[PDB]
Every structure is written in structure tokens, then in C-alpha cells.
Automatic annotation (TrEMBL):
InterPro entries: GH (IPR017853), Glyco_hydro_77 (IPR003385), MalQ_N (IPR048458). It catalyses: Transfers a segment of a (1->4)-alpha-D-glucan to a new position in an acceptor, which may be glucose or a (1->4)-alpha-D-glucan. Residues 71-161 form the MalQ N-terminal beta-sandwich domain. Belongs to the disproportionating enzyme family. It holds the Pfam family Glyco_hydro_77. This is 4-alpha-glucanotransferase. The lineage of its organism: Bacteria, Bacillati, Actinomycetota, Actinomycetes, Mycobacteriales. Keywords: Carbohydrate metabolism, Glycosyltransferase, Transferase. GO terms for biological process: carbohydrate metabolic process. One of its GO terms (molecular function) is 4-alpha-glucanotransferase activity.
Length: 704
């Protein structure tokens, strides 16, 4: 009887039907419901066919277990709300409740009316009471405490801001920034790929021409030794940072190594440095192995006592999660290596090494943000938060108690993707995460924001719900699981508000009004991408004045070809030569030209380009590359968007896509395309401001 399945699905927030991303109505199969419920910990028959009795028994156990929760898993409230919560105690025993604030201060709650009858459950009579929190608690991470004779309980009480302060700031004073894929941008001294030094250096360069932020790719740690993941969107953790970005020569203890070792290191550096001058695809693995070898040597060097106390202070701040990550790295290194007979690696010393790499990443990122802000950026580095983690990695082990690893995150079928998508990530368990007081979400966010002025949240709908499939199944067999958006969104806002940060939520698909509003009311910005935007009012491209104010607006993204390529049809040419367009190349080119023509006509109505009447012009008759770039940038600049973003790729005439979505690494070198100009020549950070194209695009993007 599906009625009982539906009832059980409802209690666990598992959707029993949905509309797919091509507008079809799907009723989720029984099989999918049972597998997703099991992935959430529900004990249903192993044959994946369960009795109506077994389902009815799990309904009753849910209600019973809810009735015996002494405190809620946790309690999350917006500042000012006198929120009412239930407490359950053995009937006739005390319900002594108080609050302990994050800073150690105690506060009181007040009892309010509760009409629920007591119930007898496993031989004990339980009652319910309601209490109300005060309406004037400060923002932060507090606790509720319950004492009932010798029984006690606690839960998180998390108070979240009504609205991000940066939202009104930028609405009133709109700014521009630059986006760069930092691994692909080299200086003369990079080891073949961009590093934290380059990060700070690049920020200081683009700040001189008016940029107020530098938006970058996710920097989350991947494998602790090569081989390593090219994609920044499948990291091993979303909290810790990838050591591959360390510039070894910037570590103060580097200079304590002996000169002969320094020369050997210089010999390694000089070889990677020649790669900086070529347009050859980026190779992380040998660069990483080489950096790790040198980091092993620097790790032997003794620290001055000020430096030692800094390191100790970092270790103290990061707590157990840092030790768990580092120990997982020590274990993975040990298992991959093949050590000598009679010799063991020292697990604790290895653990310490992986802790110390995180300290380095912290300090090099702090130095980069300090550089950005000292160069005049209002925001600075804007970090990007991937949606999730590799299913076999550090977080998947260390955070297993708050994940549902038998499910896999994805997307339902598309016109574009008829199989849907499987991203492979394990989802948060919606209840267990709340039982842990959302502390894993807090901790990843706080690290991501620590040396940033802003965060871009990939797949922001995931704060509300995720599309999941039983692991290893097709995405057609998936469904939605719902999360407590007040908790996930509220805590994103809280951590961002504490960090003085901007929040941008990638919101490309079109969801329910309530979801949009939940984000907008908190001051979370949307994302508008010129090539995808349609007028709400007219058929055709979005008009200048129709661009949303509470948004980040760009011309392009790291998932499209850069604008020099896109103008020439490279989105269609690249998809065709990879055999990932199955439609007629010529009919698509023609659709592309028509849509570009329409956009250039809207830009001309806004005076951003001359009104040449673009529909009907041949592709090569529309103006020079530089003029089209200037036009599209000016058009975006004079939208009412709080924030606009110039892609670094567009400043130098890059024609190569960084990533072709829906291709794999054997098809194209996704995430490995170094920054080159229109002639296929490498552009170093040192050269950026020598090129006329850079200055034209910068000027065209200026907002005051």
C-alpha cells in the first residue's frame, strides 16, 4: 500500500513525485522510495521489498522517537524571533531549561502553554512542555541545556541575521570585479600553475583598474599526493585547502634550508617555470610531487618561537576536524607508498606534516587577501564553495556520521541531458546534520570565509533540497530530499555576516517563489549570465534595465567558452568536434547568430554599441573583437546589478573553454587550459597591463 510508503516518505522529507528539468511529471517508484529511506537509516527489509507492517512500524517508531527527544536536534532562529520549542521529559520529572551563549553568559527561557497529552513509550510515561527563547539573543552559536533529575541533554541554539549588511551596501554602491581560474594564471615565478602568491599578485593588479573583488575557483583540498583531481568541483573535503597552491619559496623557513638544496629546488622551479611561457596543458601531478618533496624538507626546519606560537595557535583554533583530516592524509600516503622492511612511517609525525600544510595554506591565503585589500579592493578575494565532496575521500570518512553515503547527488533529466546527471557526491543526512548542531556546515563555511570578502555558493538550491539517486543507479531513478533551509541558509548568512562578507548563490534554474524569497530577504545575491538571460517582458534578450539588482551579473562563466570564442561560434565548434553535439552544426550556428544578434541589438538600445541593426549581418560584419567586447562589457556595467564580473579570459582575448560540461577528461583537458591570448600565447600576470585589450575591457567595465 503506497499510502503507507507516502506517509513514511513525508516524515523523512523524501519527495514522492517531482517535475523534471524538462517539465515532465514523474511519480517516484516504490523502489526508489525504499532505497532512499534506507540510505537515510530507515530500517526496511533488505530485499528492498517491505511489508505494510514494517512500513507502519517505521511510521510509529518515527513518532515515538520524536516524542522521546529531550531537546530538538538543534534550534535555529532569526535574530528577534521568540521561537517556541518542545522539550520531552519523563512525566512528573523536572524540565529545567536554560541557555548558554557562545561567550559563556547564561540566559533564561520562558515556559509557554503546551496542550499535548503524555504518552507511554517502551514502559515510560513521557510528557511534553514548550519553552520560548528571548527575542534579544546575540548572533551566534549558543546552546540549550536541559536537566531532568539525573538525565541531561543539550542542543545547539543558533541565532542567525535577518539580512547580510553587504547586500544594501552594494545595492547602493554597485561595484565590479574580475573572475580568474587561478591555477591557470601564471607569473614568471609560478611552478607551471598559479599559486597563492599569484592570487594576491593578480588581485593587486586588477585592483589598479577598479576591480573590488577577485572571484576564483574552489580551492578545497583534493588528494594529499599525486595523482590528483583536476576538477576543483570534486574535492576531498570542502573545509580544508589544497596544498598544491603553496608557493614554497614564500615560506619563512624556506630560507633556512642549505644553499645546495635551494639550488636543487631552483633547478626544479626553473623547469616548471618554462611551462609558464607555453600554452601547453596544465599538469598538476608532477608539480605537486615536486612541491611535496620540498615541503618535506622545509618541515624539518626549526621555527622561531613566534612562528611556533602562531602554528600552535592555528592548530588550537581548528580543533579536532584538522587532526581528523590530517590523519586521513597520513593514512592515504602510507597506503599508497611502499615502505621498506623493518621500517614504519611515523603516523603522528605525518599527521603533523598535513596539519602544518594547512597552516601554510592559511597564512598564504591571509597574505593574498591582505594584498587585495591593501590594493584598494572593498571585498577582496571571493571564494567559490563546491556543492560536495568525493565519495571515497577525507570528508566522506570523517563526516560519515552526518552523510547519507548510499545516495548520490545529481540532477534530474534535461532536454540537454536525457539521462540526467550524477555528480557522485554523498549528500548531507538532513536529520543527523541537525543533531550535530550543524557544526560541520559551520566549520567548512568559517574556513572558506576566513580570508575572503565573499562566497559564491555553487548550486544554492541545495540549501533547500537535493536531487539524489541510490548510489550507482541512473539519475532517472532519483528523487528530491528536503533540508531545513532556515538552518542551512540561516547559517550561511550568519557565517558571512560574521566575516563581513558578500554571499552569491548560483541560481540558474527556476524554482518556487518562496525559495527565491528566502534567499533575497537574507541579502543573498543571485547570478545573471548575459548569454542565458531572457526578458521577463518581451520575447528575446533581457533589457539592461530588467537585470535584477540583487545579483552578480557577468557576460560569461568558467563553463562557457570565453567571449572571443563564443562570438565566433566556439561553443558549437567545440561540442561538435568532441561528438557531444548530436544536432546539425549549421542549424545551431544559425540559432547562435540570431540570438547574438538580438543581444547586440538590445545592447545598442542601451547605447553600449552603435545601432547597426545586427540581425541579418554576417558573423564577421558585426565589428572587431575589441569593439564587441567593449560593447558587452559596457552593457553589463550599466545594469543596476549590485555586482558585475569581468572574466579575466575576456580581458586577454582567450578563445579556449576551461571546461566543456558533459565531457570527461579523456575528451578535453577540462580544468587544465592555461591563460592565453587570441594567438594562443601565454599571458603572464606581469604582462596583463601591457596589453591594449586588457585596458579597453577594463575601461568598458568601469561603473562610476
Amino acid at each position: 500500500a503506497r499510502r503507507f510508503l507516502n506517509e513514511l516518505a513525508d516524515l523523512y522529507g523524501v519527495a514522492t513525485s517531482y517535475t523534471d528539468y524538462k517539465g515532465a511529471h514523474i511519480e517516484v517508484s516504490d523502489d526508489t522510495l525504499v532505497k532512499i529511506l534506507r540510505a537515510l537509516g530507515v530500517n526496511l527489509d533488505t530485499s528492498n521489498l517491505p511489508n505494510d507492517d514494517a512500513i507502519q512500524r517505521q511510521i510509529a517508531l518515527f513518532h515515538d522517537r520524536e516524542f522521546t527527544r529531550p531537546l530538538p536536534p538543534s534550534v535555529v532562529a532569526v535574530e528577534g524571533d521568540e521561537l517556541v520549542f518542545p522539550v520531552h521529559v519523563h512525566d512528573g520529572s523536572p524540565a529545567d531549561v536554560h541557555i548558554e551563549l557562545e561567550d559563556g553568559t547564561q540566559r533564561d527561557v520562558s515556559q509557554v502553554e503546551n496542550w499535548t497529552a503524555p504518552r507511554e513509550i517502551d514502559g515510560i510515561r513521557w510528557g511534553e512542555a514548550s519553552f520560548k527563547i528571548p527575542g534579544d539573543l546575540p548572533l551566534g552559536w549558543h546552546k540549550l541545556h536541559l536537566k531532568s533529575n539525573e538525565r541531561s541533554a543539550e542542543c545547539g541554539l543558533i541565532i542567525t541575521p535577518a539580512r547580510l549588511s553587504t547586500a544594501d551596501k552594494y545595492l547602493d554602491s554597485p561595484r565590479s570585479g574580475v573572475m580568474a581560474q587561478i591555477y591557470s594564471v601564471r607569473s614568471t615565478l609560478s611552478w607551471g600553475m598559479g599559486d597563492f602568491n599569484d592570487l594576491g599578485n593578480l588581485a593587486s593588479v586588477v585592483a589598479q583598474d577598479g576591480a573590488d573583488f577577485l572571484l576564483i575557483n574552489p580551492m578545497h583540498a583534493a588528494e594529499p599526493l599525486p595523482p590528483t583531481e583536476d576538477s576543483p568541483y570534486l574535492p576531498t573535503t570542502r573545509r580544508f585547502i589544497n596544498p598544491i597552491y603553496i608557493r614554497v619559496e614564500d615560506i619563512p623557513e624556506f630560507n633556512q634550508l642549505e644553499i645546495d638544496l635551494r639550488d636543487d629546488i631552483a633547478e626544479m622551479a626553473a623547469e616548471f617555470r618554462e611551462r609558464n611561457l607555453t600554452s601547453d596543458i596544465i599538469e598538476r601531478n608532477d608539480v605537486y610531487a615536486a612541491k611535496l618533496q620540498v615541503l618535506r624538507a622545509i618541515f624539518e626546519m626549526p621555527r622561531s618561537s613566534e612562528r611556533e606560537a602562531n602554528f600552535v595557535s592555528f592548530v588550537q583554533r581548528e580543533g579536532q576536524g584538522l587532526i581528523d583530516f590530517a590523519t586521513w592524509c597520513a593514512d592515504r600516503e602510507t597506503a599508497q607508498s611502499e615502505s621498506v622492511h623493518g621500517t614504519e612511517p611515523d603516523r603522528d609525525e605525518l599527521t603533523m606534516f598535513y596539519m602544518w600544510l594547512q597552516w601554510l595554506c592559511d597564512e598564504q591565503l591571509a597574505a593574498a587577501q591582505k594584498r587585495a585589500v591593501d590594493a584598494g579592493m572593498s571585498i577582496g578575494i571571493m571564494a567559490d564553495l563546491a556543492v560536495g565532496v568525493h565519495p571515497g575521500g577525507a570528508d566522506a570518512q570523517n563526516l560519515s556520521h552526518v552523510l547519507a553515503p548510499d545516495a548520490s547527488v545529481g540532477a534530474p533529466p534535461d532536454g540537454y541531458n536525457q539521462q540526467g546527471q550524477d555528480w557522485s557526491q554523498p549528500p548531507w543526512h538532513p536529520v543527523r546534520l541537525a543533531e550535530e548542531g550543524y557544526i560541520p556546515w559551520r566549520n567548512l563555511l568559517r574556513t572558506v570565509l576566513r580570508h575572503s570578502g565573499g562566497i559564491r555558493v555553487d548550486h544554492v538550491l541545495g540549501l533547500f533540497r537535493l536531487f539524489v539517486m541510490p548510489r550507482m543507479q541512473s539519475p532517472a531513478t532519483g528523487t528530491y530530499i528536503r533540508f531545513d533551509h532556515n538552518a542551512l541558509v540561516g547559517i550561511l548568512a550568519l557565517e558571512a555576516e560574521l566575516a563581513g562578507a558578500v554571499v552569491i548563490g548560483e541560481d540558474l534554474g527556476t524554482f518556487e517563489p518562496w525559495v527565491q524569497d528566502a534567499l533575497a530577504q537574507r541579502g543573498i545575491m543571485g547570478t545573471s549570465i548575459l548569454w542565458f538571460e531572457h526578458s521577463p517582458s518581451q520575447p528575446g534578450p533581457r533589457r539592461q534595465e530588467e537585470y535584477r539588482p540583487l545579483a552578480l551579473t557577468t557576460v560569461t562563466t568558467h563553463d562557457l567558452p570565453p567571449t572571443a570564442g563564443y562570438l565566433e561560434g566556439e561553443h558549437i565548434a567545440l561540442r561538435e568536434r568532441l561528438g557531444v553535439l548530436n544536432t546539425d552544426p549549421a542549424a545551431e550556428l544559425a540559432e547562435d547568430l540570431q540570438w547574438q544578434a538580438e543581444i547586440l541589438d538590445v545592447a545598442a538600445s542601451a547605447n553600449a554599441l552603435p545601432a547597426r541593426e545586427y540581425v541579418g549581418l554576417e558573423r564577421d560584419q558585426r565589428g572587431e573583437l575589441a569593439e564587441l567586447l567593449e560593447g558587452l562589457h559596457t552593457f553589463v556595467a550599466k545594469t543596476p546589478s549590485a555586482l558585475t564580473c569581468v572574466c579575466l579570459v575576456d580581458m586577454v582575448g582567450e578563445k579556449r573553454a576551461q571546461n566543456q560540461p558533459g565531457t570527461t577528461r579523456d575528451m578535453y583537458p577540462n580544468w587544465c587550459i592555461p591563460l592565453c591570448d587570441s594567438e594562443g600565447n601565454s599571458v603572464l600576470i606581469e604582462s596583463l597591463r601591457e596589453n591594449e585589450l586588457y585596458h579597453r575591457v577594463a575601461k568598458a567595465s568601469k561603473r562610476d
